[PDB]
From a paper:
The space group of this THF complex was transformed from the P21212 space group of the apo form, containing one zNt-FDH molecule in the asymmetric unit, to P212121 with two molecules in the asymmetric unit. The structure of each monomer in the THF-bound form of zNt-FDH is nearly identical to the apo form, with an r.m.s.d. of 0.65 Å for 308 Cα atoms; the central hole has a solvent-accessible pocket of similar size in the structures of both apo Nt-FDH and the THF complex. The structure of THF is complete, in contast to that of the human structure, in which only 6-formyltetrahydropterin was observed, providing complete information on the inter­action between THF and its surrounding residues. The pteridine ring of THF is buried in the central cavity and makes a stacking interaction with the side chain of Phe89. The pteridine moiety of THF is recognized by the main-chain carbonyl groups of Gln88, Ile90, Asp138 and Gly140 and the amide group and OD1 atom of Asp142 through direct hydrogen bonds and by the main-chain amide or carbonyl of Asp138, Gly140, Thr143 and Gly144, the OD1 atom of Asp138 and the OG1 atom of Thr143 through water-mediated hydrogen bonds. The hydroxyl O atom of Tyr200 exhibits direct and water-mediated interactions with the O atom of the pABA moiety within each monomer of the dimer, whereas the main-chain atoms of Ala116, Glu201 and Ile203 interact indirectly through water molecules with the O atom of the pABA within a hydrogen-bond distance. In the structure of THF-bound zNt-FDH, the aromatic ring of Tyr200 is observed to rotate by 90° to make space for product binding. An additional potential THF binding site is identified in the cavity between two zNt-FDH molecules, which might contribute to the properties of product inhibition and THF storage reported for FDH. The average B factor (52 Å2) of the THF in the cleft near the interface between two zNt-FDH molecules is greater than that of the THF in the active site (32 Å2), suggesting relatively weak binding of the second THF molecule.
[name] (FDH), which is composed of a small N-terminal domain (Nt-FDH) and a large C-terminal domain, is an abundant folate enzyme in the liver and converts 10-formyltetrahydrofolate (10-FTHF) to tetrahydrofolate (THF) and CO2. Nt-FDH alone possesses a hydrolase activity, which converts 10-FTHF to THF and formate in the presence of β-mercaptoethanol. The N-terminal hydrolase domain of FDH (Nt-FDH) binds folate and is homologous to glycinamide ribonucleotide formyltransferase (GART) and methionyl-tRNA formyltransferase (FMT), enzymes that are crucial for de novo purine biosynthesis and translation initiation, respectively. In this study, we determined crystal structures of zebrafish wild-type apo Nt-FDH (zNt-FDH) and its ternary complexes with the substrate 10-formyl-5,8-dideazafolate (10-FDDF) and the products tetrahydrofolate (THF) and formate.
Residue numbers in the entry: 1 to 308
């Protein structure tokens, strides 16, 4: 069928490539503008194949569909919209235009963790199960009926990057392909998201990823890994904003005070700079080990090297 891909990044690119190689006609690609001479991988792949590429900075203005970009989108005659990591709300004029409507990839088990940072909040909350959903776009935000859903286990030391690379990206690409295949045969279902279990969390940015030291070690662990690598959990140390990466929960070594003590504004007790990284304490007296640190305008350095 004729497909318009509305999205961005490598995930969008791979979904594009896989749908193309299943024989679908990509009549158009709608991604984000170039940033600093960097072209989105989805736009790069499509232009190569000779597929129309659009880079609208926005779809709506004054809470109303921009008619010119709606007309440019309509022109390619999509029979189905596919939205692999689309960062903006798409007007219903566009969503409802194709014969088959529009499907969206969401990296959480909907209705849980609606929102733009679902993977982060999966880990911040300490969820044991994660996964992705393919759902039909409607007029709300991540509220549309489910087409298919796939689960995976969340590992205790998973960060955003590890669970994305291991499962959410590669199985997500397959999920989108399978969904399009189900639509092509008319078998794709529409399961209304249940009320029970619906949550929504705000997008994670640097501003709201600051660490709260007054939790048990496990909760701090979840916060750090839930924002690793982006946008990076951080806290003030020595009047510097320091970001934390590569947290693992730790039983031993205890203490061992073989490491070098580091005072941290607001922590339950002093951290420890050790051979294997920065040991931090939660208010339960238990430990997590942070392997990598980062200062404002700087490359990552090992936690072991904080003083050096
Ligand atoms: N029709 C329709 N269009 C959609 C979706 C939909 O379900 N229905 N789902 C969208 C994907 N999911 C989200 C969920 C939350 C946000 C979000 O909250 N973005 C912040 C970004 C904040 C920022 O970057 O500064 C905002 O305020 O716009 C964006 C896409 C794709 N477009």
């Amino acid at each position: 069928m004729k497909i318009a891909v509305i999205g961005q990044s490598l995930f969008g690119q791979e979904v594009y490539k896989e749908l193309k190689n299943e024989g679908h006609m990509i009549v158009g690609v709608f991604t984000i503008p170039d940033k600093d001479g960097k072209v989105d991988p989805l736009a790069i792949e499509a232009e190569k194949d000779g597929v129309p590429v659009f880079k609208f900075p926005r779809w709506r203005l004054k809470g109303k569909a921009i008619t010119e970009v709606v007309d440019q989108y309509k022109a390619v005659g999509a029979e189905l919209n596919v939205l692999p990591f689309c960062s903006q709300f798409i007007p219903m004029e566009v969503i409802d235009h194709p014969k088959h409507g529009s499907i969206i990839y969401h990296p959480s088990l909907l209705p849980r963790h609606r929102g733009a940072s679902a993977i982060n909040w999966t880990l911040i909350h300490g969820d044991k199960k994660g996964g992705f959903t393919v759902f039909w776009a409607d007029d709300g935000l991540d509220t549309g009926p489910i087409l298919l859903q796939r689960e995976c286990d969340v590992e205790p030391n998973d960060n955003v990057n590890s669970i994305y690379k291991r499962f959410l990206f590669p199985e997500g690409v397959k999920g989108m392909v399978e969904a399009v295949r189900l639509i092509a045969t008319g078998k794709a279902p529409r399961i209304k998201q249940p009320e029970e279990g619906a949550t929504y969390e705000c997008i994670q940015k640097k501003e709201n990823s600051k660490i709260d030291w007054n939790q048990p070690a496990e909760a701090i662990h979840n916060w750090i890994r839930g924002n690793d690598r982006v946008p990076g959990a951080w806290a003030e140390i020595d009047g510097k904003s320091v970001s934390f990466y590569g947290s693992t929960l730790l039983e031993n070594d205890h203490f061992s005070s073989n490491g070098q003590p580091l005072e941290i504004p607001g922590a339950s007790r002093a951290a420890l700079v050790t051979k294997n990284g920065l040991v931090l304490f939660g208010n339960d007296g238990k430990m997590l080990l942070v392997k990598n640190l980062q200062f404002e305008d700087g490359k990552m350095i090992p936690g072991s090297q904080y003083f050096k």
